Symmetry: D2
Subunit: 173 residues, 4 copies
């Protein structure tokens, strides 16, 4: 069940707008930057960032898509089920986008998929929520909210494009 709401629609809006500004700042413009969303919600978040960056800079940013699913037996392995990145990645700054960073293993799989699409100049990572508990030496460059969790809690990201509401909450039990 739902334990607590940790980001409402306004907190998500402000966090996404701030991240768009951070991306442009960090890269000193969006020249050579592309966004790649991870799974359904990462893809909606990537689209939202691209629209915001376009409104700020007046140049559009390509958005690509990775579908990653978990295979089991526990321990699990995230594998790429589908790829739609209809633009070059070689010599670009590829910004991966996901809803939640947890152990880091999904991002490792995504980073590895981009690295074998081509030869990016760099790979960055934007997430709406970092819930801690990394199991790999991976970190986000851009983070909406740091949300401390126990190992038994779940973060649930709801976005209006699929869930009818923008909300992030902690679930348990």
């Amino acid at each position: 069940m739902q334990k607590a709401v940790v980001m409402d629609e306004q907190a998500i809006r402000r966090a996404l707008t701030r991240i768009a500004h951070e991306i442009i700042e960090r890269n000193k413009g969006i020249d050579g930057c592309v966004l790649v969303g991870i799974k359904t919600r990462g893809i909606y978040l990537a689209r939202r960032l691209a629209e915001r960056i376009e409104q700020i800079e007046g140049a559009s940013v390509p958005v690509g898509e990775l579908d990653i699913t978990l295979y089991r037996d526990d321990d699990h392995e995230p594998l790429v089920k589908g790829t739609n990145v209809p633009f070059p990645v070689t010599e670009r700054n590829v910004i991966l986008v996901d809803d939640v960073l947890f152990t880091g293993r999904t991002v490792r799989a995504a980073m590895d998929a981009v690295m074998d699409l081509g030869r990016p100049a760099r790979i960055q990572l934007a997430v709406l929520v970092d819930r801690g508990h990394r199991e790999l030496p991976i970190r986000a460059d851009f983070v909406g909210k740091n949300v401390p969790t126990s190992r038994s809690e779940l973060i649930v990201v709801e976005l209006s494009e699929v869930d009818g509401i923008d909300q992030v909450s902690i679930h348990e039990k």
Copy 2:
């Protein structure tokens, strides 16, 4: 000698816009917030931030001013003048300075605010953190972290007074 330009006008512009977003985000809106600039360049930065926040949020943020000078004979920063024409009690007071170095100026500014009234919180925004703290002070909002040696100096130039927006490192 000027050794490097570390922020140009566009870098400063982007940093101030980003800090404005951070201030609004962290405080969940700007209700109850006020800015207090430290010294000439801190005041100009505080005025810039107030304008950005108004441009983003559609609400104005009061700006106050502290004039702080160094006394010697180890130095001690003292308040030479205060112009804060609004209440500080129950507000979030955001101090603004151009560079954070030892933290001694901010300690003086924080102590000055705490003697004006009873703020809910004091926050600190600086354009540049150059390291070398001598007190347990940190900025809440930072334009750029700029590593320096103790022999180096940060120079912040702002168009209102210097005719250019630029941050540079100097030595010798």
Copy 3:
């Protein structure tokens, strides 16, 4: 109600040993360093750190004491007593407390040290940082970062006074 144990005796032991190493490393030896404990449990932690540093380095570190109490009617921490039987001028003074929360107690302690003399630097070591700062203060050395809500409370128990070394979160 006690909601969780967040550090047991072995976690506290390991954290204090690690902080002792950090203090020595950051200051490139303990020449010129002194510890000043805040309140009962801060003083016990400062004594533990002094001993660890001596066990590691083979040199003793002076320990001083500040007694700070809350006055009300918003609270204000005030110094009720000081026992710092060594010079602070030109030294690195390392304040020690059990928990960092708003930072208001540390601001009082830092202001007290700065009125004893002219330290080279003031540093801060705490067993627990529970977040929720209301001032631009940060610890230099931290045993554990323990996220809390505003309704929660950290309780630090130390064997000298409580018969157990344990940190816990409480609520209600």
Copy 4:
């Protein structure tokens, strides 16, 4: 040429001892931990950490070895040339050790090599020096010293086992 010394023998000693304490603290003991050194100097550093951890805890930590070299054409790719990890990695905390973290691409290669030796519970990263300039979302768990550098500077790590001295310095020109 040598621009500046940034860590002398004493700074390296203290940093390594402090990291050994951090490793034990972070993992709540060294139960289930193994060290894997990267290249010649990472391997000496891994051996030093293992000796320190043994002196502190009174239990030995296995040390494995990866030899990674750069292939070119620039852009480069680090590849594994040799592996000597004579113990299981499955369900262990694998702590990678290297002398310098720069773009992160060597660690990505090492992380990927461990992940295909088996199924570690987690991978951590200890480095003597983080010189910045990441090109991947990778970060060290344990760091000797953060040493700011320009893109034109080099960090040079000298260790007594091969170089006759323990010293870290910045080189240029």
